Design a protein around this ligand. Structure first.
Ligand SMILES: OC[C@H]1O[C@H](O[C@H]2[C@H](O)[C@@H](O)[C@@H](O)O[C@@H]2CO)[C@H](O)[C@@H](O)[C@@H]1O
Ligand SMILES: OC[C@H]1O[C@H](O[C@H]2[C@H](O)[C@@H](O)[C@@H](O)O[C@@H]2CO)[C@H](O)[C@@H](O)[C@@H]1O
Ligand SMILES: OC[C@H]1O[C@H](O[C@H]2[C@H](O)[C@@H](O)[C@H](O)O[C@@H]2CO)[C@H](O)[C@@H](O)[C@@H]1O
Ligand SMILES: OC[C@H]1O[C@H](O[C@H]2[C@H](O)[C@@H](O)[C@H](O)O[C@@H]2CO)[C@H](O)[C@@H](O)[C@@H]1O
Ligand SMILES: *[C@@H]1O[C@H](CO)[C@@H](O)[C@H](O)[C@H]1NC(C)=O
Ligand SMILES: [Ca+2]
Length: 476
């Protein structure tokens, strides 16, 4: 599916090993500190697609599928998919080629997309960089395919970031020489075949800053689908340029100030407001980036604060920002694990309740986004515009005039006082009736064109014209 196709999507990102087991248990042990396969599979995900679809998501992103190093290393098993050795086999822990194909079809049958995480940068090996037997790698079964062994020390030297190896002498990640034609040719061949074999709709590409930029166009082309790259850097001057070689990137620029704005009641609304504007202007296309505040490489949001209102506002932002919302499995159950491995908790241990507060909030937020898109072909290309901020508040506007979603977010938290925000710049017509679609309440624009927004318990407010809601199942 194309970049344009992907603009309208909303992604639930999950670790295949940690989302759903084949037997469907909600009690099977998964001690994250053990760093071992806990037994999630592709069949499991299939069985739990209603859970996922019930929150309004239209796609999933799953961790890599290629066959991994077999060992339990000092850092555990390759349960996460990022330590591959045979790219032409599948990781048997998750199922068979038939199961992965079944997952693709089940998603397609519900009108959903499959995104698959892929690594081009490295293989993985249990042991020191010097001890590597390159014959275990298929097809890269010689040292000739790799950069000389050295570790990345200096992250201000981009050449060294690209040419040296990630990992350490405990688990080394032999670095492919992606400057060689034979290496380019093999990966390009490989990614096209992967996509066609498994009917994959889009790719999330791991470790993109660790491969020289000229590698990526051929790879994005060979894939023939939207690719969104992980470029692990908050500076949009570093990260956004990668959009000149790949369709999109993960929104790490927005990540840091977004987290900071909502992780406590003294978070900076200003830094978030400014970065929205920076990315809107400076990045090639903010609407093909992936918005997130939680993943498997950083402490989860609730690790910073268990305030449910703060969690609700940050989730609402992720869904309503430019680009593709990305929610990481367990965020919706208010999971609070810290750095890897603590943030790879098993989703099944929650019992998958569909009435949890976050599940409901996410459902209502995706519900309005999905609906709005169905009525407004300009919604996804309209660049989210921040219209208001104060010390504890940010407001933003998205959608064609007359059909815009106006979102008001707060970091006052659950103890927040009640009061009325007089909101200017929302652009609704005087006396228009709006529905606040999270709490299903109605608001009437002033005769001065300001919107009197009732604020309470630090709760997020999401406004849309009530007339435009006619026929929908929203706020019935
Ligand atoms: O190899 C050490 C590190 O590997 C993996 O980290 C992934 C990371 O989580 C991905 O988003 C991306 O950065 O690529 C990395 C390696 O390709 C594991 O997930 C992690 O457990 C481990 O520490
Ligand atoms: O009205 C269409 C236009 O509106 C928005 O542009 C905003 C812009 O984001 C602000 O920075 C400021 O300049 O006001 C503009 C509206 O006058 C959308 O961002 C844009 O995509 C849309 O086409
Ligand atoms: O193997 C651990 C991670 O190493 C790198 O992460 C770097 C990151 O690029 C850099 O900006 C930060 O200053 O240091 C960390 C750790 O050295 C990889 O980019 C990550 O993918 C790995 O997870
Ligand atoms: O950790 C905060 C991030 O700071 C840097 O990115 C800065 C960048 O210098 C600038 O564009 C803007 O004013 O702030 C951003 C984000 O705060 C690093 O490059 C990121 O990796 C840091 O994490
Ligand atoms: C896809 O299937 C074909 C034929 O079954 C096979 O030759 C190829 O290696 C497969 N590609 C991948 C990436 O699995
Ligand atoms: Ca590299």
């Amino acid at each position: 599916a194309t970049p344009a196709d992907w603009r309208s999507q909303s992604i639930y990102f999950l670790l295949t090993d940690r989302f759903a087991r084949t037997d469907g248990s909600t009690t099977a042990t998964c001690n994250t500190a053990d760093q071992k396969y806990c037994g999630g599979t592709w069949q499991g995900i299939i069985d739990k697609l209603d859970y996922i679809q019930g929150m309004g998501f239209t796609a999933i992103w799953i961790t890599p599928v290629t066959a991994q190093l077999p060992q339990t290393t000092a850092y555990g098993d390759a349960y996460h998919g990022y330590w591959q050795q045979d790219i032409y086999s599948l990781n048997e822990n998750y199922g068979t080629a038939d199961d992965l194909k079944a997952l693709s079809s089940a998603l397609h049958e519900r009108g959903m997309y499959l995104m698959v995480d892929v690594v081009a940068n490295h293989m993985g090996y249990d042991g020191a960089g010097s001890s590597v037997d390159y014959s275990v790698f298929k097809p890269f079964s010689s040292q000739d395919y790799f950069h000389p062994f050295c570790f990345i020390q200096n992250y201000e030297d981009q050449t060294q970031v690209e040419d040296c190896w990630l990992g350490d002498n405990t688990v080394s990640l032999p670095d492919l020489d992606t400057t060689k034609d034979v290496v380019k040719n093999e990966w390009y061949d490989w990614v096209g075949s992967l996509v066609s074999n498994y009917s994959i709709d889009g790719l999330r590409i791991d470790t993109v800053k660790h491969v020289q930029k000229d590698f990526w166009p051929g790879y994005n082309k060979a894939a023939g689908v939207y690719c969104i790259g992980e470029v692990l850097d908050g500076d949009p001057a570093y990260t956004c340029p990668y959009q000149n070689v790949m369709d999109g990137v993960l929104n790490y620029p927005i990540y840091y100030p977004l987290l900071n704005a909502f992780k406590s009641t003294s978070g900076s609304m200003d830094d978030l407001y400014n970065m929205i504007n920076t990315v809107k202007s400076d990045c090639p296309d903010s609407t093909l980036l992936g918005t997130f505040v939680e993943n498997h490489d950083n402490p989860r949001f609730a690790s910073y604060t268990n305030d449910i209102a703060l969690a609700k506002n940050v989730a609402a932002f992720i869904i309503l920002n430019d680009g593709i919302p990305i929610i990481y499995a367990g965020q919706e159950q208010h999971y609070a694990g810290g750095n890897d491995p603590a943030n790879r908790e098993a989703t099944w241990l929650s019992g998958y309740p569909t009435d949890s507060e976050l599940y409901k909030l996410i459902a209502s937020a995706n519900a309005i986004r999905n609906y709005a898109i169905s009525k407004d072909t300009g919604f996804v290309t309209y660049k989210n515009w921040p219209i208001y901020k104060d010390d504890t508040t940010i407001a933003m506007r998205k959608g064609t005039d007359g059909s815009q979603i106006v979102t008001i977010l707060s970091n006052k938290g659950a103890s927040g006082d009640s009061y009325t925000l007089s909101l200017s710049g929302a652009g609704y017509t005087a006396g228009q009736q709006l529905t606040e679609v999270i709490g299903c309440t109605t608001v009437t624009v002033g005769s001065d064109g300001n919107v009197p927004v009732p604020m309470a318990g630090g709760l997020p407010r999401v406004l849309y014209p009530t007339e435009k809601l006619a026929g929908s199942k929203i706020c019935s």
